[PDB]
Every structure is written in C-alpha cells, then in structure tokens.
Amino acid sequence: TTIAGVVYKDGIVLGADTRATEGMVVADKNCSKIHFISPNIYCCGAGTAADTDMTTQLISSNLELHSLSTGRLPRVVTANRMLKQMLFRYQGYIGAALVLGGVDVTGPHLYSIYPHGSTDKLPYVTMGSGSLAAMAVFEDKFRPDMEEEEAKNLVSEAIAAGIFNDLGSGSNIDLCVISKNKLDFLRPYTVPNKKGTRLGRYRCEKGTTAVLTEKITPLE
Amino acid sequence: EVKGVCTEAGMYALRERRVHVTQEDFEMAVAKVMQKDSEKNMSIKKLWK
Amino acid sequence: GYSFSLTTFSPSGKLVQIEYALAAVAGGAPSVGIKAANGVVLATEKKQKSILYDERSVHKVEPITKHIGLVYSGMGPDYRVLVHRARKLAQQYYLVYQEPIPTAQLVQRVASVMQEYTQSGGVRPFGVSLLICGWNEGRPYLFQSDPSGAYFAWKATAMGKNYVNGKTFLEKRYNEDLELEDAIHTAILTLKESFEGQMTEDNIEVGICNEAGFRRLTPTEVKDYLAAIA
Amino acid sequence: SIMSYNGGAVMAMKGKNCVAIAADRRFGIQAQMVTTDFQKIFPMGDRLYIGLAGLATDVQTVAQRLKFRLNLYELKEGRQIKPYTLMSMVANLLYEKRFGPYYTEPVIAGLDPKTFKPFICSLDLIGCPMVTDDFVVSGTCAEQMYGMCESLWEPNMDPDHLFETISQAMLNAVDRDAVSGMGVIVHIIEKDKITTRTLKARMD
Amino acid sequence: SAGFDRHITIFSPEGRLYQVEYAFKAINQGGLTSVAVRGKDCAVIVTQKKVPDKLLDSSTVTHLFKITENIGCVMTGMTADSRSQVQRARYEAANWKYKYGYEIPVDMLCKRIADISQVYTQNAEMRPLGCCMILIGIDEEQGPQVYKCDPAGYYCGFKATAAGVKQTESTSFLEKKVKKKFDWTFEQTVETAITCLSTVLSIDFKPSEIEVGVVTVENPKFRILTEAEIDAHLVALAE
Amino acid sequence: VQVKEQSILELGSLLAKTGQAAELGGLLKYVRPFLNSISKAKAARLVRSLLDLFLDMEAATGQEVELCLECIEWAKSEKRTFLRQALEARLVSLYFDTKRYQEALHLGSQLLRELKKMDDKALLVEVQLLESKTYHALSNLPKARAALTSARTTANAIYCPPKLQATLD
Amino acid sequence: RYDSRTTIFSPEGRLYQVEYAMEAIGHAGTCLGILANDGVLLAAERRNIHKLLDEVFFSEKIYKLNEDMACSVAGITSDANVLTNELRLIAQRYLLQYQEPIPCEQLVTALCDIKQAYTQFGGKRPFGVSLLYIGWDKHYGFQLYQSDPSGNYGGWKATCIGNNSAAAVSMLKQDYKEGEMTLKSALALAIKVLNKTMDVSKLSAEKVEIATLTRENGKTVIRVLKQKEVEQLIKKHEEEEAKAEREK
C-alpha cells in the first residue's frame, strides 16, 4: 500500500496503487483506493480496508446532507473536522490512515490523518506501508508551484518507487486530478507490470471428470 | 322526480316555440334532473378506503 | 361536536381533526404536477406580499436526492421539518444498500413519519400535502402524500386554492403522450388559471425530472419559456 | 486457529454467460469428522447463490440472518434483489459485529436478474467487499486454490469447459488439504437452467 | 365562531389555529418599533429606546445584541422571552464553528432558530416565546443580508424591514421609498433609516433616544455607534 | 429514395404556389399507393395539407369535387374512418362555398349519424357550427339557433379551440 | 355520557368506543373469500377509479405476506400500513426461530393480541381495520379467518364485509355448495355475488380484483390474475343471464 498527494500551482494530484493482500498472499490485483467524498474532494485510504471503506462512506453521506441543506459547495476543513473528531472517539481502535485533498473557494488544501485523530496540513504527504519509499522521491524532486504535467510526472514516479518495494502492487497506477474547474480520474494510467504468456497445453477434455449424480432444474 | 323529467322535457319544446316532443328531449332532461353530490378532492375518500 | 381531540372516534363516522387538518391544505398556495412520457414537471405559485421580499432566498421546489424532487401546498414552516426528515432517511438506504433509493420507497417511509404525529395525544398532525417526483428504472413517477398518511400515483393533479378549477382544466387537458417541453407548456397554462395579476420570472418556480437526474430551473430559462409561449 | 476448527473450501468462477460455484461436504471437529452432508451453499433467489466457509456455527447463523433480511426486502419491493445489492447487505451485517465478529468469509455468485451478466465477489470476516472477473476462493486451503485457478482459467468459456476446470481445481487442491474433503458438490447455473453435480473424490 | 381551538394548539374547522397567531399580537405590548435597511454593501439597524426613569440606567437598556463577531441582531416583543431567544442564538453559533470549522452564515442561523420555534407549535406544553428577531450580516460573494425570524417558525430575508408596533405604516413608507433606483452610499442608507422611523412614530428624535447598529464591507465586525457620531448623522440629514 | 419522397411534397408545394392544377391534381392522383408507405395515423395531415393547397388555387370545380369523391370511394376500399370523416367535413365546406342547396344538409345529417355516435369531439364542433351557417343561410332562424346552442354545450369539453373559439364567437 | 377513552366500561355494561370502530368498517370497501377444495380465493372492489391515476403496484387490497398467505384489508388506511408491516415481521421472526413457516392460526392470534392491547391501555384508539386471511398449512390445508377491531376472530368457509355488503352473506347461504367446491365452480359464484352488491351495473373489470391460491407440486403459487382473463370471466356470467331467461 502506497498513497501520496501533492499540491501544484492550481490544484491537487492524488495517487495510489491496486493491491490488497491477506497475510503474504496477494488477494486482489485491482483494488480502488481513491474514494469519492464530494464533487471537489477525494480521499485516499490506507490501513484496515473495511475500516477505511465504512468511514469514508459515512462522512461523504454527512457532507451530502450538509451541502444540500446549505445550498453551496462544501469545504475541505469541514471534512477535516468530521474525521478527526470521529476517530478520536474510538481511541484509535478503528485503523484508518487517510489523505484528504480538495479545492475550496479558499483554494486547494491537503491533509494527512492518523487513526488516533492527529491531522497535519502539508503540501505533500505519503501514507501506507511503502510511504518511506515514495517520500524520498518527493524531497529529492519537489519544488513549489509546479505545472500540470510536471506534477503528474512526480506522483507516478513516487508511487512506482513503492511498487518496486515490497507490498507494492499488481500495478495500475491511479491518478485523481482536482483543479478549480476540471476534475480527472484515471484508473489505467500506467501498467508497468505484465503477466507472461502461458506456453503449455492445458486441454480440458469434455468428460475427463467422473460425476456421481446429476440434476437439472429449468427456469423461465 | 319523474315529474321533473316530464316538465323539463316539455320545457325544451317551449323555448323552441314547438309542441312536438321527441325522445331526444327526454334524454337531455335525464342528465339535467339527475345529479350527484360530486365529492371533490378524493382525500376524504382515500382516508376512508 | 364530539371532536376536540385525536385519540377517540365519533359515534357515526371518522376522525374529525384529520379532516380539519386537510382544510389548511386547501387554503394554501396552489401547485401543479404533470407526468409526461419522458419526465415529470413540478410547478408552483410563489408571490410575495410586498416588493421588499427577496425572491431568491427561500425556495419551493426542493431536491431530496440527485433524482428526486418535492413540492407542497400547506404551511411552509411545517414543510421544513419533513424535508429534513426525508433527507436523512434517504441517506440511511444508501448506507445500507449502496444504491439510490427508488421513489416508491420514500413514500412508504415518509408517510409513516406523517403517520406517527396522528397518534396520541398532545401532538398535532401536519397541515401539508406533498408531491414527490422521480425517474427510477426508466419509468418516471409522481406521487402525493397527505397528513392522514395515505398516498397515490398521479398522472396529473393540482393542490392548493381553486384546485377544482385546475382539475376540470386538466381533465379537459391532459393526454397520455407528450414530451417534457410540451408538459411545461400546459403546466404554466394551468397555473395561469388561478394565479394573480402579474406573472413574472419570480412569481413561478419550476423544477423538472429528466432521466439525467433532478433539476430546478433558473429564472433565465423560465423568463425565456414564459416569453410568449402562450 | 478458530478458522481451522472445522475446515472448508468455497470456490466461485466466472464463465462466458454462466457462473459456477463449488464446495466440500466434510463436517467435523478438529481431527474427527462427523458427517459428509453439511450444506455450505444456500440459494438466495433464483440464479443467485451464496457460499459460506469458516466456523460452522456462524455458517448456519449468518445464512439464517441473511434469509431474515432478504424476505423482508422482497416483500416491500415486488422486484428481486440485484447481486450488487446483496453484497452491500452482507457487508452491513458483518460490520455490526465489528468487535464481536462472525467467523466466516462469504462468497456470492449469481447472474443479473434482467440481463445475463454474471457476478462474483468475496468478503472478509468484517465486511470488506472485493469483486473480481475470474475467480474468488475462501476457506482453509486457500493457497492451494490459487495455484490451480491461476493456471487453468480461460476468459471466455462454455459451460462444458467451465465445469471441467472448476472440477480439476477443487479435486487437486482439497486432496492436498487435510481437514477438507469427503465429497465435492458443484453448482453450475445459467440463464435457462440450473445444474447440480456431485463428484467422485477421495473419501479418506 | 371560535370559540373552538382558542385554549390549546389544535386545529379549527376551516382551517387555522389561534394560539400561535395570538403571539403575533404579543409583540405589541413592548410599545416599540425597530427598522432594518439593506440598500447596498452596508447594513443598518435602527431602534429607539424608551427610558421612563432617572434612577434607571443607560447601559443596561440596549436591545442591540452581538451574536458573533460578524453577526448582530435586535430584539422586539416582550423582554424576558427575547433574551432567552438570544441565548440559543449565541449557543448554536458556536456549535457551527466547533462541528464544521468555519464561520456560520447569517442565512443558516435563522433556519436553526425557526426550527426550535417550530417544535413548540408542533409539540405542545411550552409557551411559544412571543418575541421577534431581526438579523444582519456580511456574506462572501453575496453581500449584506437582513433576515427576520417569526414566533410561528417562519423566516424570510428581505431588504427593508420593520417590526414592533408599526410594521404596516413603516413598510408602506419603504415600499414607496425603495422603488426608485437610487444608490445607497452608507449615508443614503442611514438617513432613510432615520426618517422612516422619524415620521411613522412622529418623534424626529433627540440624539440620546435611539440605537444604531451597523455592518459594512470595509470592516465586517458588528459595530454599535457612538453617541457622538449619532449626532453627526443627525446633523447631516438636517443640514 | 426518401430524398425524392419529400421532394414530391416539395415539388407539390411548387405545383401549388406557381398555380397549375392538372399537374398538382395529377400528383394527388399519383401519391395514392405512395400513401401506403408511411405512418398511417399521421398521414391525414399529409392528405389535409395537399387537399387544402389544391383547393386554394382556382375554381376548376370539375376536378375539385370529383377528386374529393375519388378519395371518398378510396376510403370505402381502404377503410380509414378518421380520414373519410375529415374529407366529408371539407366537402360540406366546399358545398357551402357555392351554396349547394340541400346536399350540404343531406351530408351533414349523415355525419351526425356518425360523429356524435363516435368518441372524437373536435370534429362535432365543426359540423354543428357549419350547419348553423347554412340554416341561417337558408333564412331559418330558430333552427339555426338550436344548432348553435347544441354547438355551445358540445364546445365545453375540448383541450383547446385555439382558433375555433373566435369562429364560434 | 360514556364516549370518553376506551377505558371505561359503560353501565349495564359495554364498550362504546369498540362499538364505534366496529360500525366504521361498513362504510369501506368490500372483500370476500369463498369455499374451495384444492384452492382458495379472494375478491375485492376498486374504489374511486377516476381516470387520472396510475396503479403502479397493481395490488392494493391484497398483500402477499409470508410465502403461502395473503390478506385483504378494510378500514382506516393509516392503520392499514402499520398492521401489514407488523404482520410480515411476525412470520419472519417465527421462521428465524424454527426454520419452518408459520402455521396460519397462531399468526392470526399474534396480531389479535396486538389489536386487543389497544383496548385496555390508555389512551389509544383501537384499530379500525378488519381483514381476511387465506393460507395453507401442513395440518389443516386451506383456511379462512376473519379479523375484528376487538381482537376477536373466527374461522369460516365463506364470509364478507358488513353494511356495504351484508346482504351477500344471505346470498352465500342461498347459493351454498359443499363438496362440489372446485375453483371454476367458485369463480362463477364470485362474479355473481359481486354483481348485486356492487350497485354499478354490468360489472366493468376495472372495478374488481380476484386473487387465488392453489397447491401445485409442493410450491403453493399465489396468483393475482390479470385484467385480460377477468374479461372472459365476466362475459361468461353475462352469457348465463341470457341462458337463465329461457325459463321465462
């Protein structure tokens, strides 16, 4: 698990990977780790998978309740206050590591949330198991107020450093670009890893398995 | 109210300066005499289904 | 009269205080709703008592989800309660089933909310009837609740004051198959039946359902729609 | 562990216009079997099944609680349930016992009620949904089942070869397991009919 | 005629209820009138005071109440019900900042006030607080606003505002006033806010008998005018 | 193919505006199996528009009333009830244009044996009002009064008489 | 007087609020079930069939409740939706507990104990709803039951509703069958009874409703039969009137 975010001169680029493991066995080769919050705010999830999923759906339901009652666009600082106040009440039992990012009237805002309830406003963050590898790419190559394709090149470089570290991915590098007006979301942005071809004949025969009892039930 | 049919059917001939009374005069007089309560808004009906 | 209360019957008929609550519905602002072949059109009447009232402050056509809208005819202060009830109730379906709630499902539940205030014995019922629209699974829908707790499924109807003139209008008017653009044309033409003198872009307020979701109309289109189109 | 107290193996596999599901038959305490007719696949409406594996208490418990909520759903609405809708229903039921959790891992397989589109997914013991396009497996002998399905699966398969692939995947993997076996039942469903077959396996 | 529902809060035959609309004439025992005016980028509250005693103080009389640093209000009706209404307004303005992390809009606050006044009509067994509230505030990308909350649970935002005893006479003056397209350059606002109250009450007041609260988009803090500069605007209109 | 199909309607409009009748009346004789090619319900607007632009041209009445009778006998053998009743209502209007004396009344009586028995309503208001013209044209005042009064109570149940109201008024 | 809450008793001595609710159902719809060997049926009436409605559910009086039972309804509609959502929730609680369907009698007594309990605890109305029961079980087969506002019930072989259609019970005895109780013999009896009680003549198909329940291969299908085959059932009875006048 390797997630990262950055703030360029106009918006926020998020990045993640596509592997969920159970033990030391790859359970999923294509998992979505970038979650919807609002039409300007997205959130990357890390930690316990079911804890991050059920948390990111509740707060996204409250902001849809909030903004439709209010009648205007939500704020990133509102989603910051809801998450750190909920997670503090569970005393860190819910294991959720989140990267919160969005563009408000006041501009872009990027946060990092720890499962005990501590939040940090930063221009660039990494979370997850391979966060140590992705952070070294940032500090070597971050400069303030980058352009669009310059910032997209930095994140896909930083995520790929964690992929070629352990607990990487069956790689489909994801990107979510949030700007002041345009919103992008790219699942197959980069496929660096391919599965090799199968060079053997595995001809399953029509009748090579003994059957004790058959049963037919039609439908309509 | 059979009389009310008989008076209003013959009344149609009076406004025509006519003494002849047809079957069409009665069939228009049936809808005139017979009416209904015409219970509107239907919410009273479906509170009480 | 026996009535005076809600927890007892009359010796002959039914509950009288619920019938008196329907009298406040008929003394409200008029409204209309027409179900067309590709969408449902809601339209209501909205006049201020003076030239001082800001018209763009409080709205009548009110969205519930991205495909469900709702109007009323009664008292606006009681209207804001069950709107906020229906918002939070619509999210509870989506947290469980992860799917936008169908329009026949809220009316099971919103009418059960208006049910509960008709119980004993120190509370009052609502004085608001509703009209609920939406386009779920291709076919669009148009329902109507009441303070008693029952509900319907209309082709076209009209509530508020002078509804009997709008009903005999729509009985002579509404056919089976028209588009949404012809539906708004006969939805303002039935609002002109019982409205007051001037009808500007701020006297009416109109929302629609497409299959592309629920939307309410800004006064730029509504000025251009009422511009000489009857 | 607690998952290794009774054993079990549930496999689902997606075909061209059809979907198959299979499970074992052995019921038993840690080293002592009891019977060979323990049901682990339960019908939840037509053309849509579910498989359970793990602790034998929570297999019979959750399959009754889910049946409790399904019949109340299919009466408030005249329609049947969509396969995406059941996955959200099961994930709600497991997450309510967040700290008292049921020890099972469900596998859902079925077709679309309107179209012919198949659907497979599996969940964790606390309700993490995970949809795939080829196969899902659950039970104690999970690592043996990944070794068979990664080599034998083909994308577009008729119901003839899909039955023969899931047969050889279940027989060769469960015979490597010790606490699973004693018979394998296979359900293969499609738009027109439902076929149930039992296989000739090692009874040791 | 009715007669019927004139003790408790139930319906009448056709179709209203009387205990809520007896609170509308419960404002008028204050013997007072308040005027709010929004013309352009500023906003003005004006309200007279009535001091009937020399032993009575001056500082503890003012009906201008500061809710938050950018939101002020004025209260009419009876006195004791007015201050408990303000205590809920000060309380829920701070809950918005705590729950949601930013300053509450003036539009959102009257929803939270009128919904509390709504339950007392729907559910019985509490007297429904016979007072009226007028708000002002500055909103980003919306300009200044003037809102009014009612004892029934109704609210509506509107430009020129009167309350107290003399609504129908002051609003009749302001309909004829706000019909010409004159600009409102922060002293066109105040001078009309004075002379409307000055002719409807027919007082043309001496400088020490009123209060004026103000807010402007150059300093969005709520501000109560000094007695010296009240005299400066009074000598401005009568040149 | 279809670009020629609407070109028949386009050239037929040129046959009407430039003022030639045997070529346009020959076109109305030509498109009669071509009427068996498109939407049969909305074909009545196509029959109406080609008949109206034919009759608005010039008094060549040897082809006017005769090609009307050709279309009547066609609908005896094609059996579209709404079209043939629409053609008779134009025909009795054509009878009034020259004051054809009793067969306008004889046709209108045979329409009222049909129309008030049917379910369509807006064609009744036309034939009730057009008889009230010709009873007044034959100087019978009280019978034209009764035909007008029956037209009033019929005209109270229509979506829009958007132009027929002023014709009635 | 004694027209207060349900508590109290009247002198001499009875319960006036219960009697007011039991007379209210006569001014409501009309429902009836008939005898049948190897089946059972229900019949209902479409009230206020005005031409600006949709009927998106196509089942209004009838509510299929467990798997092999349904019910009619008659009374206050506000209380009708409360009972049906409660009654379906009883049958699934039993099914969760024993893994066997509810045997069609103690489902009725479970509701009748709820409907009674609002007559003794103050201050509530009683339920102003009577309703029918159809079903099949392992022990007795096809059954009929009749609810009351007081919580009283009773089994039947043919029954109906009161002040609307209380004269139908006299017709059910005069045209009674016993033994020869096939479904087609009973459907012909159903359209004849609804002919007189529904005072609108000629019995248009949009004013009625017929629901059946049979036993087929151990499945107990439940049919809400469509409007097309109502038509050929009505015209059969219209033909039998022209055949019956041959004695005249």
- Using the Cβ of D4 and the Cβ atoms of chain A, whether some distance falls under 8 Å is answered with no
E165 in the Ramachandran plot: left (φ > 0), alpha (ψ -120 to 50) or beta?
A: alpha
Residue A190 appears among annotated catalytic residues = no
- Using the Cβ of E108 and the Cβ atoms of chain A, whether some distance falls under 8 Å is answered with yes
Q: How far apart are CA G134 and CA G66, in angstroms?
A: 11
Distances (CA, A) of E119 to B9, E88, E112, E153, G79: 62, 14, 12, 9, 25
Of G24, G54, G125, the CB nearest to C8: G125
Burial (CB < 10 A; 0-12, 13-18, 19+), residue G21, is buried
Contact criterion met (CB below 8 Å) for A46 and A97: yes
Note the CATH number of domain C1-230.
Answer: 3.60.20.10
The partner residues of D48 in beta bridges, in order of sequence, read D110
User: Do C20 and E152 make contact, defined as CB atoms within 8 angstroms?
Assistant: no
Structure tokens at F103: 């067969």
Q: How many helices (H) and strands (E) does chain A have?
A: 4, 14
Structure determination method: cryo-EM
Q: What are phi and psi of D33, to 5 degrees?
A: -70, 165
C149 in the Ramachandran plot: left (φ > 0), alpha (ψ -120 to 50) or beta?
A: left
Burial (CB < 10 A; 0-12, 13-18, 19+), residue F74, is middle
Residue C130: which of C99, C101, C103 has the closest Cα? Answer: C103
Burial (CB < 10 A; 0-12, 13-18, 19+), residue A186, is middle
Q: What are phi and psi of F162, to 5 degrees?
A: -75, -20
- The one catalytic residue in A1, A2, A52, A126 is A1
- Closest alpha carbon within chain C to F158: C172
Contact criterion met (CB below 8 Å) for G49 and G194: no
- Closest alpha carbon within chain C to D93: C96
Q: To which H or E segment does residue D43 belong?
A: strand D41-43
Contact criterion met (CB below 8 Å) for G209 and G46: yes
> Which amino acid, residue G232?
Q
Chain E residues bordering chain C (beta-carbon distance below 8 Å)? 9-17, 107, 111, 114-115, 118, 121-125, 152-161, 171, 174-175, 178-179
The DSSP secondary structure of C87-126, one letter per residue, reads HHHHHHHHHHHSSPPPHHHHHHHHHHHHHHTTSSSSB---
**Chain G partners within 8 Å of B45 (Cβ):** 47-48
Q: Tokens 């070529």 label which residue?
A: F23
Could you count the other beta carbons within 10 Å of the beta carbon of residue G19? Answer: 15
**Chain F partners within 8 Å of B16 (Cβ):** 142, 146
Structure tokens at G168: 């139908």
**Chain B partners within 8 Å of C25 (Cβ):** 43
SS3 assignment for G125-142 = CCCCEECEEEECCCCCCC
Q: How far apart are CA C218 and CA A205, in angstroms?
A: 66
User: Do A77 and E108 make contact, defined as CB atoms within 8 angstroms?
Assistant: no
Q: How far apart are CA E69 and CA C208, in angstroms?
A: 41
Q: What are phi and psi of A148, to 5 degrees?
A: -75, -60
- Write the DSSP symbol of residue A115: T
- Using the Cβ of A199 and the Cβ atoms of chain D, whether some distance falls under 8 Å is answered with no
User: Do A81 and E105 make contact, defined as CB atoms within 8 angstroms?
Assistant: no
Q: Using only the alpha carbons of chain B, give its radius of gyration.
A: 17
User: Do G78 and B47 make contact, defined as CB atoms within 8 angstroms?
Assistant: yes
Distances (CA, A) of B36 to A53, B39, B49: 62, 8, 20
- Closest alpha carbon within chain A to E141: A105
Q: What are phi and psi of E31, to 5 degrees?
A: 65, 55
- Write the DSSP symbol of residue D23: E
Q: After which residues is chain B broken (C to N over 2.5 A)?
A: none
Long-range contacts of G45-48 (CB under 8 A, 24+ apart): G45/G194, G45/G198, G45/G207, G45/G208, G45/G209, G46/G206, G46/G207, G46/G208, G46/G209, G47/B45, G47/B49, G48/B42, G48/B45, G48/B46
Q: Do chains F and E touch (3 or more CB pairs under 8 A)?
A: no
CA distance A125 to chain C (A): 30
Structure tokens at E98: 């705590």
Contact criterion met (CB below 8 Å) for G160 and G31: yes
Q: Do chains D and E touch (3 or more CB pairs under 8 A)?
A: no
List the Cα angle E124/B47/C159 in 5-degree steps: 85
Q: How far apart are CA A34 and CA A30, in angstroms?
A: 12
**Chain A partners within 8 Å of C95 (Cβ):** 57-58, 61
Structure tokens at G41: 């049926």
Contact criterion met (CB below 8 Å) for G83 and G111: yes
Q: How far apart are CA E217 and CA E138, in angstroms?
A: 7
CA distance G137 to chain B (A): 31
Contact criterion met (CB below 8 Å) for A52 and A72: no
- Using the Cβ of A53 and the Cβ atoms of chain C, whether some distance falls under 8 Å is answered with no
3-class DSSP assignment, residue D24 = strand
Q: What are phi and psi of E149, to 5 degrees?
A: -105, 145
Residue A12: which of A137, A131, A154, A133 has the closest Cα? Answer: A154
Contact criterion met (CB below 8 Å) for C121 and C109: no
- Using the Cβ of C49 and the Cβ atoms of chain E, whether some distance falls under 8 Å is answered with no
Virtual CA dihedral for C4, C10, C11, C14, nearest 10 degrees?
A: 160
Q: How far apart are CA D99 and CA A94, in angstroms?
A: 10
The DSSP secondary structure of chain E, one letter per residue, reads ---SSSSSS---SSS--HHHHTSTTSSGGG---EEEE--SSEEEEEEE-----SSS-SGGG--EEE-SSSEEEEEEE-HHHHHHHHHHHHHHHHHHHHHHSSPPPHHHHHHHHHHHHHHHHHB-SS----EEEEEEEEETTTEEEEEEE-TTS-EEEBSEEE-TT-HHHHHHHHHHHTTS-----SSHHHHHHHHHHHHHTT----GGGEEEEEEETTEEEEEEPPHHHHHHHHHHH--
Q: How far apart are CA C83 and CA D134, in angstroms?
A: 45
Q: Tokens 């005898």 label which residue?
A: G35
Could you count the other beta carbons within 10 Å of the beta carbon of residue A94? Answer: 19
CB-based contacts of G65: which residues, under 8 Å, 6+ apart? Answer: D75, G71, G84, G87, G88, G91
Q: What are phi and psi of D163, to 5 degrees?
A: -70, -40
Could you count the other beta carbons within 10 Å of the beta carbon of residue G233? Answer: 18
Q: Using only the alpha carbons of chain C, give its radius of gyration.
A: 18
Q: How far apart are CA F129 and CA F93, in angstroms?
A: 11
Q: To which H or E segment does residue D62 belong?
A: helix D56-76
- Using the Cβ of D39 and the Cβ atoms of chain C, whether some distance falls under 8 Å is answered with no
Burial (CB < 10 A; 0-12, 13-18, 19+), residue C220, is exposed
- Using the Cβ of G47 and the Cβ atoms of chain B, whether some distance falls under 8 Å is answered with yes
Distances (CA, A) of F104 to C224, F62, F91, F118, F138: 47, 18, 8, 21, 12
Q: Tokens 């019977």 label which residue?
A: D35
Domains of chain D: 1-204 (3.60.20.10)
CA F156 to chain centre: 23
Structure tokens at A30: 């294509």
Distances (CA, A) of A47 to A56, A131, A162: 13, 12, 16
User: Do C7 and G56 make contact, defined as CB atoms within 8 angstroms?
Assistant: no
CB-based contacts of F141: which residues, under 8 Å, 6+ apart? Answer: none
Structure tokens at E30: 């204050």
Q: What is the resolution of this structure in A?
A: 3.2
Chain C residues bordering chain G (beta-carbon distance below 8 Å)? 2, 7-11, 13-15, 35, 104, 108, 111-112, 115, 118-121, 141-142, 148-150, 152-157, 170-171, 174
Residues in B 10-49 with any Cβ partner in C closer than 8 A: 40-41, 43-44, 46-49
Mutate to test the interface with G, among D42, D62, D67, D71 (most CBs of G within 10 A): D71
Residue C58: which of C79, C42, C43 has the closest Cα? Answer: C79
Q: Tokens 């990262």 label which residue?
A: A4
Of G5, G16, G78, the CB nearest to C7: G5
Dihedral sign, Cα of residue C178, residue C182, residue C187, residue C192? negative
Q: How far apart are CA D129 and CA D92, in angstroms?
A: 11
User: Do G125 and C9 make contact, defined as CB atoms within 8 angstroms?
Assistant: yes
CA distance D64 to chain G (A): 6
Burial (CB < 10 A; 0-12, 13-18, 19+), residue C228, is exposed
Structure tokens at A111: 């946060």
With contact defined as 3+ CB pairs under 8 Å, the chains touching F are B, C
Of A58, A65, A68, the CB nearest to C63: A68
3-class DSSP assignment, residue D171 = helix
Q: How far apart are CA F57 and CA F51, in angstroms?
A: 11
Q: How many cross-chain Cβ pairs, D to G, lie less than 8 Å apart?
A: 17
Contact criterion met (CB below 8 Å) for C214 and C42: no
User: Do F157 and C172 make contact, defined as CB atoms within 8 angstroms?
Assistant: yes
Structure tokens at G3: 């027209």
List the Cα angle G138/G140/G142 in 5-degree steps: 95
3-class DSSP assignment, residue C193 = coil
Spell out the domain ranges in chain C. 1-230
* ω into G13 cis (within 30 of 0): yes
Q: How far apart are CA G128 and CA F53, in angstroms?
A: 68
Q: Kindly give the residue spans of alpha helices, DSSP state H, lying in chain C.
A: 16-26, 76-97, 103-116, 163-173, 180-188, 219-226
Structure tokens at G82: 């409360």
G58 in the Ramachandran plot: left (φ > 0), alpha (ψ -120 to 50) or beta?
A: left
Q: How far apart are CA E6 and CA G245, in angstroms?
A: 66
The DSSP secondary structure of chain G, one letter per residue, reads ---SSS--PPSSS--HHHHHHHHHTTSS---EEE--TT-EEEEEE-----TTB--SSS-SS-EE-SSSEEE--EE-HHHHHHHHHHHHHHHHHHHHHHSS---SSHHHHHHHHHHHHTTTSTT-PPP-EE-EEEE--SSS-SEEEE--TTS---B-SSB--STTTTTHHHHHHHT--SS---HHHHHHHHHHHHHHHS-STT--GGGEEEEEE---SS---EEE--HHHHHHHHHHHHHHHHHHTT--
Could you count the other beta carbons within 10 Å of the beta carbon of residue E13? Answer: 17
**Per-residue exposure over D67-99, b if at least 16 CB sit within 10 Å of its own CB, e if not:** bebbbeeebeeeebbbbbebbbbbbbbbbeeee
Distances (CA, A) of D50 to D43, D63, D133, D188, E91: 6, 9, 17, 13, 52
CB-based contacts of D1: which residues, under 8 Å, 6+ apart? Answer: none
Q: How far apart are CA A46 and CA A16, in angstroms?
A: 10
Contact criterion met (CB below 8 Å) for C203 and C55: no
Q: How far apart are CA B31 and CA A214, in angstroms?
A: 72
D198 in the Ramachandran plot: left (φ > 0), alpha (ψ -120 to 50) or beta?
A: beta
Could you count the other beta carbons within 10 Å of the beta carbon of residue B39? Answer: 9
Q: What are phi and psi of D14, to 5 degrees?
A: -95, 135
Structure tokens at G129: 């709803």
Contact criterion met (CB below 8 Å) for G225 and G218: no
- Using the Cβ of C179 and the Cβ atoms of chain B, whether some distance falls under 8 Å is answered with no
β A12-16/G63-64 pair status: unpaired
Burial (CB < 10 A; 0-12, 13-18, 19+), residue D204, is exposed
- Closest alpha carbon within chain D to G88: D72
Structure tokens at E78: 């009876």
**Chain B partners within 8 Å of C163 (Cβ):** 41
Q: How far apart are CA C104 and CA C134, in angstroms?
A: 9
User: Do D72 and G92 make contact, defined as CB atoms within 8 angstroms?
Assistant: yes
Of D64, D67, D75, the CB nearest to G88: D75
Structure tokens at E65: 């109440």
**What's the residue count for chain C?**
230
Dihedral sign, Cα of residue G132, residue G137, residue G140, residue G142? positive
- Using the Cβ of C81 and the Cβ atoms of chain B, whether some distance falls under 8 Å is answered with no
